């Protein structure tokens, strides 16, 4: 069952009871990620084992 | 089998470099981060080759 996810990565800390649905690509540099990926661009969502 | 050891100190491991570097595709610290590791310091690093 890996309908379960979870976000890894995040600009700073969410405030407590806040709901994120946000899907953008994460760019781990400071350089723009156009289109679907770029430089150390990953998905932020990944699913439970 | 004789993998080196060599322990740095009396210099600055910047680390710049590597983040500046486009080479390096993999990079994952999974007990710290770059953000952080400005303000965080090592007592010592060896370099395993």
Known sequence: ?49 | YAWNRKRISNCVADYSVLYNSASFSTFKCYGVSPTKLNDLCFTNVYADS
């Open chain 1, 1 to 49: 069952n890996y309908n379960y996810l979870y976000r890894l990565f995040r600009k700073s800390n969410l405030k407590p009871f806040e709901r994120d649905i946000s899907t953008e690509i994460y760019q781990a540099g400071s350089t723009p990620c156009n289109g679907v990926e770029g430089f150390n661009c990953y998905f932020p969502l990944q699913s439970y084992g």
